[PDB]
Every structure is written in structure tokens, then in C-alpha cells.
Amino acid sequence: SNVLHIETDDDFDSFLKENKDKLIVVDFFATWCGPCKKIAPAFEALSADRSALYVKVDVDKLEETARKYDVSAMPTFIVIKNGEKVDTVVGASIENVEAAIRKHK
Amino acid sequence: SNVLHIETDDDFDSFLKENKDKLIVVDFFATWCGPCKKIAPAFEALSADRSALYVKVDVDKLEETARKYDVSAMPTFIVIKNGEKVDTVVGASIENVEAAIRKHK
């Protein structure tokens, strides 16, 4: 897979700054969340798409990043383009994630 | 918001299992509840307190958890200390929530 695992808010911020010219899809998840785990393999498969970066982030480890993107329900997928949040998908819908990524390619 | 939105009964069970060591306040709401809305803002403000955990649950999405904590009216706030129900607060009085929080803190 090409999923990037980022473990701290500081690491996330560095990652964004290094990739201001990329389309980025971030799966915000929580360890206690069942639907997050169920969709995790589909997110892994999605990441074979080299035209975007796919990142997975634990909301308990990246509290400030989650707060920044107004994440409140799990999983939430954030699409970032040229450094800015351009879309949000709430809930474990692989179809909704595909549609959102397509919208912003 | 430091307020988590939990959306299935299993997720709630898992969340509780990860936080046997904390004091937790659960806001049982309904999508329709007028008084639920009136108090949501105050509940968010309350969660600025990092000591305890503050959670929002839709009584319609979590029937078994509601049944388990004997929640029969909305809004209802359930205080859970060290993995067990220790108090119940019914109605949109934030002060009564805080009183019940700082009673088992």
C-alpha cells in the first residue's frame, strides 16, 4: 500500500508543507471505531492511485489537526488540494470518498 | 469542541473499554430535540475540561446503549466514572451537569 501513517500534529504540519502541490486524502479515524476498521482495507486499496497522497491519522494522536479540520465523527475523510481543505466526507462510505477525490483531481 | 460523536453501540462499548480510567459525560440527544439543541453549545464549552471525556450520542442510533443506561428522555446526560454509570442528569440545565460532574470528579 501507499498509505502514509502520521503520528503527531507536528509531523502532519511538516508533511503538508512538504506537499503543498499535491492532492491529499486524509482518513481521520479512532481506535475504538468499528466502521473505520471495516473501511481501512478499501482505503489501503485506494492508495494505489499515485496521482494523490493517502494518509491515515488517529484523532487521539493528532488532536490539533482533528480540531483544525473540524473532525467530530469517525471516520472523516478530508481532501486537501494545494494546501487547503477543499472537501469533507463524513462516514465510512468508500463511494463518497471516490466521488470527492474525483471532484478534485 | 472536545466533544466526540459516537454513532453505534459497539463503538460506544469499545470507547468505554479504552477509557476505564476516566470520568465520562455522555449527552444523549435526538435529531429533533429542541432542548437538546438549546444546550449543545453549553455542553461544547464544558468539554474544554480535558480531565473528563465529553461525548454526544443519538438515542435513535444507539438504542441498546440508551436502554443500558436507562435513558428514557432527551436530553439526558449520563456520568460514567471508571467504566460504570454513577449519575444521571435529565434536562437542559448545564449547571446540573457540572454539579453532577464535579461530584464524582
**CATH for A59:** 3.40.30.10
B17/A35 touch (CB, cutoff 8 Å), yes or no: no
**Catalytic amino acids of B?**
33, 36
Q: Is the dihedral of CA B54, A64, A25, A55 positive or negative?
A: negative
**Which residues are CB-neighbours of B36 under 8 A, at least 6 positions away?**
B27, B29, B30, B74, B75, B92
Q: Is A36 a catalytic residue?
A: yes
**Which residues are CB-neighbours of A94 under 8 A, at least 6 positions away?**
A39, A42, A43, A46
Chain A residue with Cα closest to B6:
A73
Torsion over CA of B5, B84, B104 and B70, rounded to 10 degrees?
A: 70
Q: Where are the alpha helices (DSSP H) in chain A?
A: 9-18, 34-46, 63-68, 94-104
Spatial distance between the Cα atoms of A64 and A45, rounded to a whole number of angstroms: 28
Q: Does A33 touch chain B (CB under 8 A)?
A: yes
Q: 3-state DSSP call for residue B80? A: strand
Spatial distance between the Cα atoms of B29 and A89, rounded to a whole number of angstroms: 23
Q: Which three cell numbers stand for residue A53?
A: 497522497
- Using a CB-CB cut-off of 8 Å, the residues of chain B touching A32 are 11, 14-15, 17-18
Resolution, rounded to a tenth of an Å? Answer: 2.0
Experimentally determined by: X-ray
**Which residues are CB-neighbours of A85 under 8 A, at least 6 positions away?**
A69, A78, A79
Q: 3-state DSSP call for residue A89? A: strand
Chain B residue with Cα closest to A34:
B11
CA distance A32 to chain B (A): 5
Q: Give the number of other CB atoms < 10 A from CB of residue A63.
A: 15
Return residues 62-81 of A near B (CB < 8 Å).
67, 72-74
**Which residues are CB-neighbours of B11 under 8 A, at least 6 positions away?**
A32, A33, A34, A35, A74
Domain that holds residue A53: 1-105
CA distance B72 to chain A (A): 24
Say which of A34, A67, A72 has its CB closest to residue B11. A34
- Using a CB-CB cut-off of 8 Å, the residues of chain B touching A31 are 14, 18
**How many Cα neighbours within 13 Å face the side chain of A48?**
4
Say which of B7, B17, B18 has its CB closest to residue A73. B7
Domain count within chain B: 1
CA distance A91 to chain B (A): 10
A35/B4 touch (CB, cutoff 8 Å), yes or no: no
